[PDB]
């Protein structure tokens, strides 16, 4: 047994990672604050927002962390992954390089995250269809090849944004 | 080969052109054309035919050697 806060049953620490400009801050802001903006401020270090949700009648508190995607604020060893309950790997569906680097983000999870942490591949900017480069089938083939759930999304138009985070919260509850 | 046949149809040297026979070629044709491949880029790609073919064949031949250095790529 352990102490339990009356407001929330489960504290699920989520973490967003991915190349710069993939839309991690936009996704975090759209989910935790229903706001979006064209002004780009490159994240440094860490940021987090808390959002309380409900799934299967359980009050779930999500602490979603947004890590800096730029080369200069990244390091080989990382201690942000430590204690994450689930990790979202974001990529920009309009930039194949961000999708290719997903392979490299995954190996960071297998090295520093919890041994069986939940993972979720997210393809932000799905609203730029005239500029999209990856196929949904190309991503699904890759996500399923590793068993990680996947949802294409758009922070701009809220498209699947809520569902992406809600899905990982459910998956973590399923894990524990 | 498919693009070259489309060139013949484009320049009036053939009456009409069917869709590609193997779906992997149609999937690629769809990819290329949906990505904004203009007709002039098809003509230019066809001029680079020999280069792309030889180069692709040589790139593959290096991948056939990538097993010898698989440990250093990490
Ligand atoms: N069209 C479109 N543009 C988006 C979307 N999400 C983000 N953007 C654009 O991408 C820019 C950067 O978004 P960020 O969330 O700050 O990117 P990031 O992943 O946080 O990058 P870092 O903070 O450097 O790690 C935004 O200012 C928007 O211009 C989206 O869903 N659709």
Swiss-Prot record, chain A:
It catalyses: GTP + H2O = GDP + phosphate + H(+). The lineage of its organism: Eukaryota, Metazoa, Chordata, Craniata, Vertebrata. The modification N-acetylserine is found at residue 2. It comes from the Eukaryota. Transmembrane segments: none annotated. GTP binds at residues 20-21, 23-26, 38, 43, 69, 124-125, 127, 155-156. The gene is RAB1A. May interact with YIPF5. Interacts with C9orf72; the interaction mediates recruitment of RAB1A to the ATG1/ULK1 kinase complex. Interacts with GDI1; this promotes dissociation from membranes. (Microbial infection) Interacts with L.pneumophila AnkX. Its cofactor is Mg(2+). This is Ras-related protein Rab-1A. One of its GO terms (molecular function) is GTPase activity. Regulated by guanine nucleotide exchange factors (GEFs) which promote the exchange of bound GDP for free GTP. Regulated by GTPase activating proteins (GAPs) which increase the GTP hydrolysis activity. Inhibited by GDP dissociation inhibitors (GDIs). Phosphorylated by CDK1 kinase during mitosis. (Microbial infection) Phosphocholinated at Ser-79 by L.pneumophila AnkX, leading to displace GDP dissociation inhibitors (GDI). Both GDP-bound and GTP-bound forms can be phosphocholinated. Dephosphocholinated by L.pneumophila Lem3, restoring accessibility to L.pneumophila GTPase effector LepB. Belongs to the small GTPase superfamily. Rab family. The modification (Microbial infection) O-(2-cholinephosphoryl)serine is found at residue 79. Glycans are attached at residues 72, 74, 82, 111. Mg(2+) binds at residues 25, 43, 66. Pfam families: Ras.
Curated annotation (Swiss-Prot), chain B:
Ubiquitously expressed. Myristoylated. It is found in: Late endosome; Cytoplasmic vesicle, Autophagosome; Membrane. The modification Phosphoserine is found at residues 66, 71. It comes from the Eukaryota. Belongs to the protein kinase superfamily. Ser/Thr protein kinase family. Component of the PI3K (PI3KC3/PI3K-III/class III phosphatidylinositol 3-kinase) complex the core of which is composed of the catalytic subunit PIK3C3, the regulatory subunit PIK3R4 and BECN1 associating with additional regulatory/auxiliary subunits to form alternative complex forms. Alternative complex forms containing a fourth regulatory subunit in a mutually exclusive manner are PI3K complex I (PI3KC3-C1) containing ATG14, and PI3K complex II (PI3KC3-C2) containing UVRAG. Regulatory subunit of the PI3K complex that mediates formation of phosphatidylinositol 3-phosphate; different complex forms are believed to play a role in multiple membrane trafficking pathways: PI3KC3-C1 is involved in initiation of autophagosomes and PI3KC3-C2 in maturation of autophagosomes and endocytosis. Involved in regulation of degradative endocytic trafficking and cytokinesis, probably in the context of PI3KC3-C2. This is Phosphoinositide 3-kinase regulatory subunit 4. It comes from Homo sapiens (Human). The chain holds residues 743 to 816 of 1358 of the full protein.
